[PDB]
Structures are given as structure tokens and as C-alpha cells.
Copies of this chain bind each other. A is one copy, B any other.
């Protein structure tokens, strides 16, 4: 066999604790190279210490091939052990029938394996629930709605910035425009969100900051006055909670804005500033050479977000900075009862900080949701001691590439399978899935205003293990290129809203919350049934939910389902190009 393609990494996503007495174990092999895998596993000490003749390796446990990413196959088994100590090894058999044992000591013929020595085996030494990954149950039942607050609704003209423009969803906004959106506007349209079936609101930054996006924080302890005040934000969280809607805020801890008191003190006092070591300043005075692009300087003497001199990086290794940020993070949860933090540029802040942050948040709220914004693979933040999940950009990015750019269905399934095998099973169910955002082009623009394609993308994404999110205005078909064009004033004029798409989104949210989310410890199955034709299945012990997506150029016939949940063709058997059909059936 292909020995170089076989790997087990102990104490990782390949070997982890699920509950007090139960672990999940995975093995990677080369694709279709290994025909079968059995696990030899038991209490390490039982070998030497128990007087019985029985030994744990005499009774293998069958592992199951669960996924393939086109390069590797992934195998998994669940193991229960009352002594809460586990030694294990793998019995692998290849296509020609060559069998070997694979352990911490390498590859062996079965006859040459020292199976009586506990130190031969891989080890899960004691099952430690304090170290395990935990997923908050309520996230399972959530569909999120992302609000960029300057652009959702102006509920109060009296707090509008100078130069506020008339509200017009057909505008192409500039980088520095203001339209007057605020917290009162969100409060005014909570009925719309409840009627859509939303159960969680994700807000972009709302703290005091000079810009329209407010990622250049001036004061983390104050609601921006053009958005509202403390009383109004408390009123908003309570009204959301009254409707069964959770609230997630944006924490921008990697950098601070240059109009903050801290940075301004650095500019005044140089290295004698009490805040000098809160930043990353290579040479004093802190300076840069301005360019014609507000967001770019080539030679700042301090580290920044990207190359923008207005966003000096915070030194989160400094204990004064750790204390400052933890106090901010605690304040908004303890005083306003928010339910989750979305962490801006989370990957550029150290693990030491994130572990302290995790500890603080879980002590306040055991079911808190910590969501990191990271575009690349994020295994090291998803062990169970830092974040709950990350933005699932790679996963939704593959979905978009398939629907928009003519990839093979095999390629998409390979990519999604790869993603799932990066992380623990429970982690995958917490990942945050959005097909667009305040940073990227809008769905309807990506789809070149093909509404059928947009519906296909949304439905496919809403069937995935992670939790879905709708960017404000998706439900009415709003268009937009990249930032700032993806930040148009919300469309509230009915003559400009796509009512068909709104009705469809209501139905899809209901399939997600009432059908998919109520499955019990379901599995997902990806089947490539034809050229650009995919069957997705979610199934538990009683119920199977099947979706078929025809994204080729021919018609596809399927058996008439007894119980159709959602479809785009009027036919109950025919799927034209870009049609899909979702149905439910009992498992026999």
C-alpha cells in the first residue's frame, strides 16, 4: 500500500474526547488505496495488569470510510472506555490484501507487533473533559442576519452625520458616504426580521469611530453617537431577545483607530506616552508619509492593519492591553446580555490572548458563541480552548466556485470533504456560512441577476452542516460589487423589492429551522449522480432529507417524491438546468 499517505496525529481532530467516557478517532489513508481499517484499542494498563486471558487487541473495532477529498480517504470510529484511558493502533489492509499494523512506533507485520507493550500504541492517556471542545446547542437552531448598521434603516434623523445623503438603495455608495442608518432603525424593523424567520442578528461595529464602517475604533466603551446610546442598545437587545433573536457584536481588537485617545497620546508624547507599548512602534516619533490613497502608506514606523496608517496594531502581548480588551469584552456581555462575539482579523492576535478571552467569556456565559473571522484553515483556533467556530469562507467559496464557474461536481465534493475533515465533528456544525458580506460582492451580482442560480446557491448552502447567515437585503435581491458597492442603503420601497425571492427565502429558512435543524445527530452524504448533478442527503435514525441539484445543461428526471418540501420547477419529476428539488422520506 501507499504507506506515505497513511497518517494518524494523536491528540488532535483525529483523536478527541466527546464526553466523559467516549472518544472519536480518525485515520487518513491514500484515496482508494486501503480496503479496510480496524481499530485495536483498550485501557493501556489492562494488558500487563489484569489477570484475565482476554486482551483488548483480540477484538478489533471496525472503522468506517466517512469522507474522501480526492487525494486521501478518511476513516472514523467512536470508542467507549470506562477506565477513561486508551491505547490504540490501526489494522490497515490495502487493495492487494497486504495487512499491516500502524501505531505510534510505525508500520509492522501483525506477527512483529509488540501488542503486549502499552508503549507500542498511540495514546489518549486520560479522557479530560476540561480540555475538550464544546458546542453551544442554541447555535444549531439559528439562522443569522447580518446588518451593516449605517445602511439598514435610519430610525432617527436627529443623530445623522453631517452630509448625510437621501436614502436610496439604487445609489452606488462612495467610500466616505453617510446615509444615517442607526440602532433605532434596527429596532423599527425587528418585525421584518421575525417575519423572515431570523433568529440571530450579527452587527458590524457599533462603537464610536469616525468612519461609516467603524473598524477604526475611537472608543470601545461607547455606542457611536450617530447610532445611539447605551439605553437604546439595551432596549434593542431586550426587544431582540423578546422575539427569540440572539445578538452578536463585532470585536475589532487587532487594531485601534488613530483618533483614539491612546494613539493620540502616542503622537503627543512619543515613547514617554503611557500607551507607547500598547502598540508596535519601530521608530519614534510614530509617523508615515501620506499618499493620495487614504488607506495606504508605504513607510509607517509602526505596524498596522494591512498598510493603512489609520489602524495601528495593538500589542495584545502587553498585560495592560490584555486587561483593557478583556474589560471591554466583559462589559458588553455583562451589562447588555449579548450572546456572541465576532472577532475581526482574529488570526493576527495571539493564542495566549484568545485563551484568556475564551476563559472570561465562558465564565460569564457557559453557552457563549465565539466566532473568529479567518479566511484560511483555522485548526489551531478550534481545539476547544479559543473560538467556537470561524467564518467559513473556504467552504462557501467552494460552493460559489461550483455554481458560478463550471467546476465538476466531483471537485466541489472533494473540497467540502477536505474542509469537514479538518475539524472536529461538533466544530463543523458551528461554522458560520455566508455567501456574501460587507467585504465581498453581493450574491445577486455574482449570479449576474440570475435569480434561479441565486436560489440554488442559497439552498445548497442552507443544507450544509454549518449555521447559515443572510446578509441584509439578500432577501429582496439587492445588487452590489465589492466594498463600498456591497453596502447600499437597504431597499424598503416595495416597487424595488423582489417579492418572489422574499417568499422563497421565508420558505427556505423554514426548511432549515423546522426540518433540517430538528434531525437528531444526523449525517451528511454527498453523491455525485451526474455531470454537474449532486444529491445531498441529511439523515438521522428516522428521517432522510434529500436535495437534488441539476446544474448541467440537460434536463434531469427523478422519481416522484411523496413529500416535496421545496422545488423550483412546476414538475414533480423534471429538473431543468439550475433547478433543484428538496424532499423528505422515512428511512427503511
Binding site for B on A (CB under 8 A): 2-5, 7, 9-12, 29-31, 33, 45, 49-51, 71-72, 83-85, 104-107, 118-119, 121-123, 125-126, 128-131, 296, 298, 303, 306-307, 317, 347-352, 355, 374-377, 379-380, 385, 393-394, 415, 418
Q: Which residue on chain B has the smallest CB distance to residue A105?
A: B394
Q: Which residues of B contact A30 (CB under 8 A)?
A: 2, 4-5
Cα separation A131 to B128 with both chains bound (whole Å): 23
State whether A418 touches B50 (Cβ < 8 A): no
Q: Which residues of B contact A303 (CB under 8 A)?
A: 83-84
Cα separation A85 to B255 with both chains bound (whole Å): 15
Cα separation A105 to B414 with both chains bound (whole Å): 11
State whether B130 touches A350 (Cβ < 8 A): yes
Q: Which residues of B contact A51 (CB under 8 A)?
A: 298
Given contacts A4-B71, A7-B7, A85-B348, contact A122 B376 (CB under 8 A): yes
State whether B107 touches A350 (Cβ < 8 A): no
Q: Which residues of B contact A349 (CB under 8 A)?
A: 126
Cα separation A484 to B11 with both chains bound (whole Å): 33
State whether A11 touches B85 (Cβ < 8 A): no
State whether B296 touches A49 (Cβ < 8 A): yes
> What would be 23 A-B contacts, judged by CB atoms less than 8 Å apart?
A3-B71, A4-B4, A4-B29, A4-B33, A4-B71, A11-B380, A12-B380, A45-B306, A49-B307, A50-B307, A104-B377, A105-B394, A106-B418, A119-B376, A119-B393, A123-B347, A125-B348, A126-B347, A128-B317, A128-B351, A129-B317, A130-B350, A131-B352
Q: Which residues of B contact A10 (CB under 8 A)?
A: 376-377, 379-380
Cα separation A385 to B350 with both chains bound (whole Å): 12
State whether B72 touches A4 (Cβ < 8 A): yes
Partner of A2, one of B2, B107, B355: B2
Q: Which residue on chain B has the smallest CB distance to residue A381?
A: B11
Q: Which residues of B contact A352 (CB under 8 A)?
A: 128, 130-131, 385
Cα separation A415 to B394 with both chains bound (whole Å): 37
Residue from the set A71, A121, A355 with the largest chain B CB neighbour count within 10 Å = A71
A448, chain B: closest CB distance, angstroms: 21
State whether B379 touches A11 (Cβ < 8 A): yes
Q: Which residue on chain B has the smallest CB distance to residue A72?
A: B4
State whether A131 touches B350 (Cβ < 8 A): yes
Q: Which residues of B contact A49 (CB under 8 A)?
A: 296, 306-307
A93, chain B: closest CB distance, angstroms: 17
Nearest 6 CB-CB pairings of A with B: A4-B5, A4-B30, A125-B347, A128-B350, A11-B380, A126-B348
Q: Which residue on chain B has the smallest CB distance to residue A3?
A: B71
Cα separation A351 to B129 with both chains bound (whole Å): 11
State whether B71 touches A317 (Cβ < 8 A): no
Q: Which residues of B contact A350 (CB under 8 A)?
A: 126, 128, 130-131
A393, chain B: closest CB distance, angstroms: 7
State whether A317 touches B130 (Cβ < 8 A): yes
Cα separation A4 to B351 with both chains bound (whole Å): 30
Cα separation A49 to B118 with both chains bound (whole Å): 55
Cα separation A415 to B107 with both chains bound (whole Å): 11
A443, chain B: closest CB distance, angstroms: 19
Q: Which residue on chain B has the smallest CB distance to residue A84?
A: B303
Given contacts A298-B50, A307-B50, A350-B128, contact A31 B4 (CB under 8 A): yes
Q: Which residues of B contact A11 (CB under 8 A)?
A: 379-380
Q: Which residues of B contact A306 (CB under 8 A)?
A: 45, 49
State whether B307 touches A45 (Cβ < 8 A): yes
Q: Which residue on chain B has the smallest CB distance to residue A397?
A: B119
Q: Which residue on chain B has the smallest CB distance to residue A350?
A: B128
Q: Which residues of B contact A45 (CB under 8 A)?
A: 306-307
Q: Which residues of B contact A2 (CB under 8 A)?
A: 2, 4-5, 30
Q: Which residues of B contact A375 (CB under 8 A)?
A: 118-119
A473, chain B: closest CB distance, angstroms: 25
Q: Which residues of B contact A394 (CB under 8 A)?
A: 104-105
A288, chain B: closest CB distance, angstroms: 14
State whether B130 touches A376 (Cβ < 8 A): no
Q: Which residues of B contact A85 (CB under 8 A)?
A: 348
A349, chain B: closest CB distance, angstroms: 8
A88, chain B: closest CB distance, angstroms: 11
A558, chain B: closest CB distance, angstroms: 32
A392, chain B: closest CB distance, angstroms: 13
Q: Which residue on chain B has the smallest CB distance to residue A12?
A: B380
Cα separation A2 to B131 with both chains bound (whole Å): 36
Partner of A376, one of B12, B123, B126, B351: B123
